Design an enzyme around this catalytic site. Structure first.
Site, PDB file in Angstrom:
ATOM      1  CG  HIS B  43       3.196   6.962  -8.112  1.00  0.00           C
ATOM      2  ND1 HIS B  43       3.845   5.893  -7.538  1.00  0.00           N
ATOM      3  CD2 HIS B  43       3.241   7.961  -7.193  1.00  0.00           C
ATOM      4  CE1 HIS B  43       4.237   6.264  -6.301  1.00  0.00           C
ATOM      5  NE2 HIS B  43       3.897   7.515  -6.039  1.00  0.00           N
ATOM      6  CG  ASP B  99       4.528   3.057  -9.582  1.00  0.00           C
ATOM      7  OD1 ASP B  99       4.635   3.956 -10.441  1.00  0.00           O
ATOM      8  OD2 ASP B  99       4.335   3.308  -8.365  1.00  0.00           O
ATOM      9  CB  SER B 198       6.842   7.485  -4.708  1.00  0.00           C
ATOM     10  OG  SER B 198       5.788   6.769  -4.112  1.00  0.00           O
TER      11      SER B 198
HETATM   12  C1  LIG Z   1       4.128   8.280  -4.827  1.00  0.00           C
HETATM   13  C2  LIG Z   1       4.824   7.641  -3.550  1.00  0.00           C
HETATM   14  O1  LIG Z   1       5.436   8.811  -2.869  1.00  0.00           O
HETATM   15  C3  LIG Z   1       3.877   6.931  -2.557  1.00  0.00           C
HETATM   16  C4  LIG Z   1       4.651   5.928  -1.677  1.00  0.00           C
HETATM   17  C5  LIG Z   1       3.798   5.226  -0.681  1.00  0.00           C
HETATM   18  C6  LIG Z   1       4.639   4.215   0.086  1.00  0.00           C
HETATM   19  N1  LIG Z   1       3.983   3.855   1.351  1.00  0.00           N
HETATM   20  C7  LIG Z   1       4.450   2.956   2.224  1.00  0.00           C
HETATM   21  N2  LIG Z   1       3.745   2.736   3.348  1.00  0.00           N
HETATM   22  N3  LIG Z   1       5.615   2.266   1.969  1.00  0.00           N
HETATM   23  N4  LIG Z   1       2.877   6.223  -3.361  1.00  0.00           N
HETATM   24  C8  LIG Z   1       1.557   6.509  -3.251  1.00  0.00           C
HETATM   25  O2  LIG Z   1       1.122   7.362  -2.468  1.00  0.00           O
HETATM   26  C9  LIG Z   1       0.596   5.754  -4.188  1.00  0.00           C
HETATM   27  C10 LIG Z   1       0.341   6.656  -5.406  1.00  0.00           C
HETATM   28  C11 LIG Z   1      -1.148   6.538  -5.705  1.00  0.00           C
HETATM   29  C12 LIG Z   1      -1.789   6.353  -4.346  1.00  0.00           C
HETATM   30  N5  LIG Z   1      -0.752   5.583  -3.585  1.00  0.00           N
HETATM   31  C13 LIG Z   1      -0.901   4.792  -2.472  1.00  0.00           C
HETATM   32  O3  LIG Z   1       0.077   4.211  -1.955  1.00  0.00           O
HETATM   33  C14 LIG Z   1      -2.302   4.608  -1.864  1.00  0.00           C
HETATM   34  N6  LIG Z   1      -2.158   4.865  -0.373  1.00  0.00           N
HETATM   35  C15 LIG Z   1      -2.828   3.158  -2.139  1.00  0.00           C
HETATM   36  C16 LIG Z   1      -2.989   2.788  -3.619  1.00  0.00           C
HETATM   37  C17 LIG Z   1      -3.933   3.460  -4.446  1.00  0.00           C
HETATM   38  C18 LIG Z   1      -4.068   3.113  -5.838  1.00  0.00           C
HETATM   39  C19 LIG Z   1      -3.263   2.091  -6.399  1.00  0.00           C
HETATM   40  C20 LIG Z   1      -2.314   1.402  -5.575  1.00  0.00           C
HETATM   41  C21 LIG Z   1      -2.185   1.758  -4.192  1.00  0.00           C
END
Ligand SMILES: *C[C@@](*)(O)[C@H](CCCNC(N)=[NH2+])NC(=O)[C@@H]1CCCN1C(=O)[C@H](N)Cc1ccccc1
Ligand SMILES: *[C@@H]1O[C@H](CO)[C@@H](O)[C@H](O)[C@H]1NC(C)=O
EC number: 3.4.21.5
Lengths: 28, 249
Positions: B43, B99, B198
């Protein structure tokens, strides 16, 4: 190969400040 | 990283920063697994709703860094990408299943006291280490709080959580290609990865051979560091065959 052995820690026989927390989790 | 602390110098030498060339923008985390391959979350490279669908030429990586914003003379290295490989079955429309992505460097990077690769787990190592209650370590330059950004790389150690607990904590569909980690409501300890982390690595140190292994990739969560919730990670060993295929190819 040489993966996973850090030059400034494992290679010099030095422990980082929190890795003991990981080792101890293997017990509890 | 929320509720973590500053990394010591050279503490995570496989840490990689992923940047957008123009405008220059720190995009995500990633990890070095050989002198020419970098592992990250899919992602970070492909997520249409966020207008992300990058090609090799759109990006760059910086390796060996500690400070988030300051240039580190004779320590940090910049590398261009030759090719990006996103898992063919990555599901961005539903739950970010699989992912994961590989990036081949245009040229091998030289290892140093600050740059060194992390190990990928073998079956035995995964069986022994990826168990509930066992702690792994996550690192990154992502948000310090749910929302700001750290001056230097952050680190936090978190316990792997039982699958059913992970499942009951969210309505989002979890799969075998993910695992979750984090402290529980009762625990005094806290900590979580957050937006911007991420692609970063969830690593574990083997008490058998003293090497660090990458078991997960920061993938998703709902909010950051909220009690009752857990962070989700791409299950690296589970996708190891795909990884091997790309590299062999
Ligand atoms: C792309 C990364 O920086 C980020 C990491 C999030 C980690 N959070 C915690 N609390 N450890 N990922 C994201 O922001 C991902 C990308 C798409 C949206 N997303 C989410 O985490 C949403 N908050 C929830 C989600 C939406 C769609 C599919 C799966 C999860
Ligand atoms: C990314 O854009 C390329 C080049 O325009 C296009 O071929 C591809 O379909 C896009 N990726 C997706 C699945 O959105």
């Amino acid at each position: 190969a040489d993966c996973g052995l850090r030059p400034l820690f494992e290679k010099k026989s030095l422990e980082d400040k929190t890795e003991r927390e990981l080792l101890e989790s293997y017990i509890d | 990283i929320v509720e973590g602390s500053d990394a010591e110098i050279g503490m995570s030498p496989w840490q990689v920063m992923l940047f957008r060339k123009s405008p220059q923008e720190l995009l995500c985390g990633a990890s070095l697994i050989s002198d020419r391959w970098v592992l990250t979350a899919a992602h970070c490279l492909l997520y249409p709703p966020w207008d992300k669908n990058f090609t090799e030429n759109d990006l760059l990586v910086r390796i060996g860094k500690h400070s988030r914003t300051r240039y580190e003379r004779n320590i940090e290295k910049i590398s261009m990408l030759e090719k990006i490989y996103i898992h063919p079955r990555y599901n961005w429309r539903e739950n970010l299943d699989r992912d994961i992505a590989l990036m081949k460097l245009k040229k091998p990077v030289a290892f140093s006291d600050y740059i060194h690769p992390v190990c990928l787990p073998d079956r035995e190592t995964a069986a022994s280490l990826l168990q509930a209650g066992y702690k792994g370590r996550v690192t990154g330059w992502g948000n310090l709080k749910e929302t700001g950004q750290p001056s230097v790389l952050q680190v936090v150690n978190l316990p792997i959580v039982e699958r059913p607990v992970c499942k009951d904590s969210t309505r989002i569909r979890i799969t075998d290609n993910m695992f979750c980690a984090g402290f529980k409501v009762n625990d005094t300890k806290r900590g979580d990865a957050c937006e911007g982390d991420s692609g970063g690595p969830f690593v574990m140190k083997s008490p058998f051979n003293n090497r660090w292994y990458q078991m997960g990739i920061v993938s998703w969560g709902e909010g950051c560091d909220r009690k009752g919730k857990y962070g989700f990670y791409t299950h690296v060993f589970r996708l190891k065959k795909w990884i091997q295929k790309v590299i062999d190819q």
